[PDB]
From a paper:
In a CRISPR-Cas system, Cas proteins form a complex with a small CRISPR RNA (crRNA) to detect and cleave invading nucleic acid (DNA or RNA) that has a complementary sequence to the crRNA. The Csm complex, with the RNA cleavage site located in Csm3 subunits, targets and cleaves ssRNA at 6-nucleotide intervals. In this study, we determined the cryo-EM structures of the Csm complex from Streptococcus thermophilus, with or without target ssRNA, at 3.3–3.5 Å. The results showed that the Csm complex displays a spiral-like architecture, with two spirally stacked density columns, including a single Cas10, a single Csm4, and multiple copies of Csm2 and Csm3.
We determined the near-atomic resolution structures of Csm proteins complexed with a 40 nt crRNA (from Streptococcus thermophilus), with or without 49 nt target ssRNA-bound, using cryo-EM single particle analysis. The cryo-EM micrographs and 2D class averages of both complexes display clearly a worm-like shape with mixed particle sizes. These heterogeneous particle images were classified computationally into two particle populations each yielding three-dimensional (3-D) reconstructions for the apo state (big [3.4 Å], and small [3.3 Å]) and for the target ssRNA-bound state (big [3.4 Å], and small [3.5 Å]). In total, the big maps contain 7 repeating Csm3 and 5 repeating Csm2 subunits, while the small maps contain 5 copies of Csm3 and 3 copies of Csm2. The apo and target ssRNA-bound states also correspond to DNase inactive and activated states of the complex, respectively. In our structure, an endogenous ATP molecule was observed in both the apo and target ssRNA-bound states, within the Cas10-formed binding pocket. The structural comparison between the apo and target ssRNA-bound states of the Csm complex revealed no substantial structural difference between the two structures. The shift is more pronounced in Csm2a (~1.2 Å) than in Csm2b (~0.9 Å) or Csm2c (negligible).
Residue numbers in the entry: 3 to 297
Write the structure that this text describes.
Amino acid sequence: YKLYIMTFQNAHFGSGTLDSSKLTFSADRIFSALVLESLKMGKLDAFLAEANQDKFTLTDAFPFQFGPFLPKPIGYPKHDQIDQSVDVKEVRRQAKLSKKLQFLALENVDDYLNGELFENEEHAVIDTVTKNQPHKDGNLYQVATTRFSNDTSLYVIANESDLLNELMSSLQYSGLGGKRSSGFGRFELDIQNIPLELSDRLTKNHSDKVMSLTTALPVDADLEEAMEDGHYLLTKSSGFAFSHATNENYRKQDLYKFASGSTFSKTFEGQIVDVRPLDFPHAVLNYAKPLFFKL
RNA sequence: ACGGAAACUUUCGUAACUGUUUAAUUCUGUUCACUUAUUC
């Protein structure tokens, strides 16, 4: 509906452990950031009645290098396309190149299903930095960073309103993920109006071989009915909570969701799960609002 | 209500000791203040 192009430079997005880092990040990082900063501004109760309005949703961090990128379809293609049958060694060595691929181009969303295999474009390299502490037994730690290159940018698709544009205006000067108390999260928001005439297949009604993204999460009333005959991949996303009145900061429960680009068969619903381990004066919200692409 | 929050590759240390641009070498070899001339 409306994409928000933003580029990163020397950022950090861990996945499992603080020392490790990935080029992208899950969709729950953006939703858990605007709600945390809404209380500091003075409108936490205003955004609570907006996220639960069905039409309001968010997208994952997709690369943008002279064109929007989309994840590869999980399980596609099937066992029918061999792509130039020459030898069993040449066909087997090129099948892994598509497995290590991260995102596909906007113009290759239709040619990949017909029979085409190629190596993903080199977006950025994983670089790490070292730190220590002199007045504490000389201890040290290692953390990784993400330095984009070759004009590597990202974009998130949301809904146009007169309240969301002001909440994200301060996020570019406040950090986003990783070591926020250093400067690993500052970016620049490039606002736009017209997205693209091809990337308008986002629907949530009919079910014609759709594809769920942004880590799907089925509802209790529709789990196995949409899980049978599908392609998915279980991941992992958790960590310690961040509150201001606990004196302990309890651990959030595990929420093994899916991956960006899973192909099911029917249309889900999307709910908001509440993470309450012991007791908290507030409520740890979560995204869990997957979209669908016509493919 | 962000696998996050708290954190100096920091504290220490002359690129240093030693060693003549030195030894050898005449600004000298040839050269009339000269030629003509009554203090008558």
